[PDB]
Amino acid sequence: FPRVKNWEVGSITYDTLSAQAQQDGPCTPRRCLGSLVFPRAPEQLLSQARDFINQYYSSIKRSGSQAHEQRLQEVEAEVAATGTYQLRESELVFGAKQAWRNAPRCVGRIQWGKLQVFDARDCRSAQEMFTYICNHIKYATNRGNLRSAITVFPQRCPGRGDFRIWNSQLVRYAGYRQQDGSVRGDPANVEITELCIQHGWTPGNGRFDVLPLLLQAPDEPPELFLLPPELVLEVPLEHPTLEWFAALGLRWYALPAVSNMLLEIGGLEFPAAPFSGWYMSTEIGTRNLCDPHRYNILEDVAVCMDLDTRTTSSLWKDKAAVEINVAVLHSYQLAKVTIVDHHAATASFMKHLENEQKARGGCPADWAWIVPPISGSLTPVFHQEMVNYFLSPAFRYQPDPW
Amino acid sequence: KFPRVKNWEVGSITYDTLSAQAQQDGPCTPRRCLGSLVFPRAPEQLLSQARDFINQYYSSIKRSGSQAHEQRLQEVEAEVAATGTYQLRESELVFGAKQAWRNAPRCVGRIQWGKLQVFDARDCRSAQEMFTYICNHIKYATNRGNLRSAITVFPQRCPGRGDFRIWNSQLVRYAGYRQQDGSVRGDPANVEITELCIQHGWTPGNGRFDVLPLLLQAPDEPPELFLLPPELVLEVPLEHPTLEWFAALGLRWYALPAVSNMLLEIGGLEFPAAPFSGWYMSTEIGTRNLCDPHRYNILEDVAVCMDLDTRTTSSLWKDKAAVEINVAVLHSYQLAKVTIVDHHAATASFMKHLENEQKARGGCPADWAWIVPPISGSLTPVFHQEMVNYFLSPAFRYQPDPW
Ligand code: HEM
Ligand code: HEM
Ligand SMILES: N=C(Nc1ccc(CCNCc2cccc(NC(=N)c3ccco3)c2)cc1)c1ccco1
Ligand SMILES: N=C(Nc1ccc(CCNCc2cccc(NC(=N)c3ccco3)c2)cc1)c1ccco1
Ligand SMILES: C[C@H](O)[C@H](O)[C@H]1CNc2nc(N)[nH]c(=O)c2N1
Ligand SMILES: C[C@H](O)[C@H](O)[C@H]1CNc2nc(N)[nH]c(=O)c2N1
Ligand SMILES: [Cl-]
Ligand SMILES: [Cl-]
Numbered sequence: 055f056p057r058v059k060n061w062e063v064g065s066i067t068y069d070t071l072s073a074q075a076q077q078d079g080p081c082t083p084r085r086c087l088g089s090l091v092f093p094r095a096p097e098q099l100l101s102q103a104r105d106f107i108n109q110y111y112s113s114i115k116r117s118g119s120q121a122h123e124q125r126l127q128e129v130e131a132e133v134a135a136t137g138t139y140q141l142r143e144s145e146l147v148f149g150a151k152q153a154w155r156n157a158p159r160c161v162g163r164i165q166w167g168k169l170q171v172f173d174a175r176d177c178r179s180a181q182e183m184f185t186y187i188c189n190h191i192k193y194a195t196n197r198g199n200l201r202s203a204i205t206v207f208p209q210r211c212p213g214r215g216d217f218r219i220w221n222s223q224l225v226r227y228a229g230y231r232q233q234d235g236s237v238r239g240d241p242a243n244v245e246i247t248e249l250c251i252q253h254g255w256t257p258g259n260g261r262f263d264v265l266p267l268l269l270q271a272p273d274e275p276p277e278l279f280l281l282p283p284e285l286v287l288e289v290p291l292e293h294p295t296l297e298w299f300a301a302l303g304l305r306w307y308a309l310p311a312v313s314n315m316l317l318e319i320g321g322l323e324f325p326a327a328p329f330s331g332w333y334m335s336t337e338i339g340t341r342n343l344c345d346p347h348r349y350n351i352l353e354d355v356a357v358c359m360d361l362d363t364r365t366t367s368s369l370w371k372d373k374a375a376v377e378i379n380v381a382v383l384h385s386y387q388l389a390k391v392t393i394v395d396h397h398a399a400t401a402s403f404m405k406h407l408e409n410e411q412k413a414r415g416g417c418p419a420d421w422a423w424i425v426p427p428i429s430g431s432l433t434p435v436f437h438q439e440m441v442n443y444f445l446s447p448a449f450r451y452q453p454d455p456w
Numbered sequence: 457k458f459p460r461v462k463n464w465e466v467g468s469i470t471y472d473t474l475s476a477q478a479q480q481d482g483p484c485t486p487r488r489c490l491g492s493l494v495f496p497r498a499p500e501q502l503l504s505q506a507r508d509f510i511n512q513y514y515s516s517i518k519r520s521g522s523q524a525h526e527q528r529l530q531e532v533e534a535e536v537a538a539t540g541t542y543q544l545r546e547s548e549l550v551f552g553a554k555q556a557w558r559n560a561p562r563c564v565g566r567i568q569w570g571k572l573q574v575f576d577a578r579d580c581r582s583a584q585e586m587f588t589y590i591c592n593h594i595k596y597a598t599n600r601g602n603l604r605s606a607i608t609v610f611p612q613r614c615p616g617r618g619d620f621r622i623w624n625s626q627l628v629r630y631a632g633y634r635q636q637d638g639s640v641r642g643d644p645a646n647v648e649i650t651e652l653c654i655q656h657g658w659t660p661g662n663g664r665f666d667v668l669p670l671l672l673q674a675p676d677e678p679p680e681l682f683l684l685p686p687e688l689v690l691e692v693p694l695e696h697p698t699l700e701w702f703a704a705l706g707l708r709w710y711a712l713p714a715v716s717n718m719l720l721e722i723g724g725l726e727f728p729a730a731p732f733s734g735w736y737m738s739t740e741i742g743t744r745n746l747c748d749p750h751r752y753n754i755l756e757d758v759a760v761c762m763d764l765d766t767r768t769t770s771s772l773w774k775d776k777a778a779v780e781i782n783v784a785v786l787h788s789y790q791l792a793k794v795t796i797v798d799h800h801a802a803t804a805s806f807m808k809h810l811e812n813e814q815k816a817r818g819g820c821p822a823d824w825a826w827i828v829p830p831i832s833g834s835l836t837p838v839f840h841q842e843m844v845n846y847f848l849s850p851a852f853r854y855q856p857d858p859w
C-alpha cells in the first residue's frame with residue numbers, strides 16, 4: 055500500500071485502492087514511463103462481466119442478494135447463447151459514471167456523479183448516429199449552461215464492424231496544408247481535414263472552419279454530415295482591457311466533446327461513445343492557442359503587447375500566455391458559457407481526492423496531466439503526490455478507423 | 457525491448473536503450489506508477505559496482521580493453537580482497553563526480569555536466585579542516601558573481617569510523633524561526649536545522665533572511681558550529697525593473713545554490729559529504745522559494761500591491777503576480793552581475809542535452825515532473841518531450857538526516 059504525501063500541508067494517506075488495479079501500466083522497477091502519452095475467449099468475457107456485476111451490486115448495497123445471483127446467472131446464459139451479453143440501463147449508467155470516475159488524467163472528476171447518459175445502443179445507421187449526436191450537442195450545450203453527457207452507441211461484437219466517429223472531437227476546426235508548408239487552421243486536424251475533403255467536403259479557407267462529421271456505421275464507408283451552424287456554439291475571444299485583442303479574430307467553441315475513445319464496461323467495448331463536459335480555461339488559452347504545434351499565437355500576442363521578444367529573460371512568453379488565458383476566461387463569462395479556471399479546478403480536484411480517499415481508499419491520478427500547463431506550482435495539485443493505475447470500467451484510447 | 461520516446465511538438469521518435477542498464481530499482485511496478493513521489497523510498501557486490509565504474513572510466517577516455525584498463529581492474533579487485541574496500545584514483549574521482557551529475561534525473565542543468573571543478577578533500581581529518589575546504593569552495597564557486605560549478609569530495613565512508621556529514625541541506629540557508637503560534641519568521645523549510653543550530657550554541661537573529669551557521673560533523677564527533685564570513689556569502693537584493701515599490705518588500709536571495717546533504721556514490725564507494733554547487737534557475741527562487749504557500753508565501757501581498765483583484769480566481773491574479781516576481785529575480789541578479797538562467801533558456805539547453813546524450817549513450821534518465829518548470833510548463837519544450845526515469849551509477853542519492 056503506497057504512502058501518499060501532500061508536501062504543502064504535510065498530510066499522509068495510504069492508497070489501498072491501487073491493489074485492485076486491473077490491467078498493467080507501462081512502468082517497471084527498472085524504469086518509469088509515467089510521462090508517455092500512449093502507454094504502449096468466452097471465459098475472458100465472463101470473468102470481467104462477473105467482476106463488474108459484483109462491483110455494481112456492492113455499490114447499491116444489494117451485495118450477495120437475490121437480485122445479485124439472478125443477474126449473474128442471466129449474464130452466464132446470455133454469453134453461452136450469443137457470445138456476449140447486454141447491460142441493463144442502470145448498469146450502463148453506473149458503468150459510464152465509473153469510467154469517468156476512474157480516468158486518471160481527468161481533473162474534473164468532482165463532477166463524476168452528475169452525468170447524463172443517452173442510450174443509443176439501438177442505433178442502426180450513420181444517419182441515425184447523426185441524430186443522436188445532434189441531440190447530444192443540443193442537450194449538453196444548453197445555450198451555454200453546459201451539462202455533462204455521454205451517448206453510448208452499440209457495442210462491438212464478432213462478425214460485424216464497429217460504429218465509429220472518425221473525428222477526435224465533435225467540434226474541430228479544419229487545418230489546411232498550405233503551398234508553403236505551413237498550416238492554416240488547427241495543425242492537429244490536418245489529417246481529418248484531408249479525410250473530410252477526400253470524402254467530398256467542400257473546404258473552407260479560414261483559421262476556424264468547423265469540420266463536418268465523418269460517421270461510420272458497421273461494415274460501410276463513412277458518411278459526411280454537416281453540423282448545423284446554430285448547433286455549434288462558439289465564443290469570439292476578446293480581452294477585458296487590451297482592446298486590440300478582439301481584432302486578432304480568435305475564437306473557440308463551447309463544447310469539448312471527445313469522440314475517439316473506447317468505453318469499456320464489464321468486458322464489453324463501445325468504440326463510439328462520445329462524452330462532453332465543459333472546458334478548463336488552460337486547455338484553450340494555453341494548449342490549443344499557445345502550443346507551438348497548434349495555433350502557436352504566443353509571439354503574435356506578445357508583439358501586440360509591445361513586449362521585448364528578443365530575450366527570454368523578460369518573460370514575454372509568460373506574460374502573453376497569461377493574458378491569452380485572461381481573454382479566454384473573460385470571453386466565456388461574458389458569453390455566459392460554462393468554463394472553469396485552473397485554480398478553481400485544481401482546488402476542486404483536491405476535494406475529490408479527499409472524498410475518494412473516504413469512498414474507496416484512494417484515487418488513480420496522472421500527476422503530469424492533473425497539474426495545469428501554466429502556473430503549475432501555484433495550484434495545490436503540484437504539491438500532491440499521486441498514484442497512477444488502471445481501474446475498470448474505463449475510457450481507453452483506440453486505433454484510428456482508417 | 458526498448459521504450460519508444462516521442463516528442464509531441466516536433467513528432468520525433470527515439471528509443472531509450474540506456475534504460476536497460478539501470479542498476480537500481482525504482483518505486484514503480486506494472487500495477488501502479490509512483491513516479492510523482494518525492495522520496496522513491498559485501499565483497500563481490502562492491503566488486504561488480506567497482507568493475508562497472510572502471511569500465512565506464514576507461515570507456516570515457518577511449519582506452520577500453522587496454523593494458524591499463526585490465527591492470528586497473530586487477531588492482532581494484534586485489535585491494536577489495538585484502539581490505540574489503542578500495543581507493544579511487546584522482547582521475548576516477550573527477551570523472552565519477554561528473555558522471556553522477558550527468559546521471560541525475562531531476563537536474564535540468566546537465567548541459568553543463570562536463571564543466572565541473574572537483575576539489576579533492578579526501579585527506580580531510582577534522583571539522584575545522586572541513587570548514588576551510590567549504591569556504592574555499594564557496595569562494596571559488598561564487599567568483600564575485602561569475603558563478604562556477606564545483607564539488608568538494610570529503611572522505612568516503614569506511615567501516616569502523618563514522619561519516620563526515622554536513623548537517624545543513626545547503627551551504628547557504630536562511631533561518632526559519634518557529635513562532636509560538638506555529639507560524640514562522642524566515643524560511644519555513646529550514647525550521648529544523650535552525651533549531652539544531654540554536655541547540656548547539658548559535659545566538660539566533662530575528663530577521664527574515666538570516667544566513668545560518670554550518671553544523672559540521674567529523675567522524676564520531678558531535679556536530680561543530682562554524683559561522684560563514686559575511687563577505688563569503690554573496691546576496692542579491694530584490695527589486696523590479698518597473699514596480700518601484702517592490703524594493704520596499706525588503707526581499708533578497710543568495711547567489712550560490714550549494715546542496716550539501718546528498719550522498720555521492722561512485723563505483724560502490726559512498727561519499728556522505730560532498731557538497732556541490734552550480735547556479736540558480738530563476739523559477740527556483742521566484743516561484744518555489746518565494747511563492748510556495750509553505751515557504752515565504754508572498755504571492756498575495758505582491759498581488760495586493762499590484763492592485764489586482766484577489767477576491768476571484770478567474771482574474772488570474774496569482775499568475776500575474778508570480779510572473780512579476782520571477783521578473784524581479786531575473787532583473788535583480790542581472791543587475792548585480794550574478795549568474796542566473798531563466799526557465800526558457802534552461803529547458804531549451806536541456807533539450808540539446810537530450811540530443812547529445814541520445815547520440816552519446818542512447819538515452820537519458822529524466823524525471824518529467826522535476827524537469828518541467830513550476831510556471832509556464834507547456835511554454836517550454838521539455839513539457840512536450842516524453843521522458844524515461846531510471847537510476848544509473850555514479851549517482852547523487854538522498855540519505856537520512858544525521859540526527
Ligand atoms: C465536467 C467538467 C470537466 C472538466 C473541467 C474536465 C477537465 C479535463 C481536462 C482539463 C482534461 C485533460 C484533457 C487534455 O489535456 O487534453 C480531461 C481529461 C479527461 N476527461 Fe475530463 N473534464 C470534465 C468532464 C469529463 C466527463 C463528463 C468525462 C466522461 C464522462 C471526462 C472524461 C475524461 C477523460 C477520459 C479524460 C482523459 C482524456 C485523454 O487521456 O485523452 N471528463 N478532463
Ligand atoms: C550549472 C547550473 C545548474 C542549474 C541551472 C541546475 C538546475 C537544477 C534545478 C532547477 C534542479 C531542481 C532543484 C529543485 O527543484 O529543488 C536541480 C536538481 C539537481 N541538480 Fe542541478 N543545476 C545545475 C548544476 C548542478 C551541479 C553542478 C550538480 C552536481 C555536480 C547538480 C546536480 C543536481 C542534482 C543531484 C539534483 C537533484 C536534487 C534533488 O533531487 O533534490 N546540478 N538542478
Ligand atoms: N495528438 C495525438 N494524440 C493525442 C491527442 C490528444 C490527447 C488528449 C486530448 N483529448 C481531448 C480531450 C480529452 C478529454 C477532455 C478534454 N477536455 C474536456 N474538458 C472534456 C472533454 C469531454 C469532457 O471534458 C479534451 C491524447 C493523445 C495524435 C496524433 C496522431 C495520433 O495521436
Ligand atoms: N521537503 C523536504 N525534503 C526535501 C526538500 C527539498 C528537496 C529538493 C530541494 N533540492 C535543493 C536543490 C537541489 C538541487 C539543485 C538546486 N538548485 C540549483 N540550481 C543547484 C544546486 C546545486 C547545483 O545547482 C537546489 C527534496 C526533498 C522535507 C521536509 C521535511 C523533511 O523533508
Ligand atoms: C510528454 C507529456 O506526457 C505530454 O506533453 C503531456 C504532459 N501533460 C499533459 N497534461 C494534459 N492535461 N494534457 C496533455 O496533453 C498533456 N501532455
Ligand atoms: C508532489 C510533487 O512530486 C512535488 O511537488 C515535486 C514536483 N516537481 C518538482 N520539481 C522540481 N524541480 N522541484 C520540486 O521540488 C518538485 N516537487
Ligand atoms: Cl480541446
Ligand atoms: Cl533553493
Ligand SMILES: [Gd]
Pocket residue numbers: none
Ligand atoms: Gd501600437
Ligand SMILES: [Gd]
Pocket residue numbers: none
Ligand atoms: Gd524571431
Ligand SMILES: [Gd]
Pocket residue numbers: 698699700
Ligand atoms: Gd513604475
Ligand SMILES: [Zn+2]
Pocket residue numbers: 081085086087088484488489490491
Ligand atoms: Zn512510473
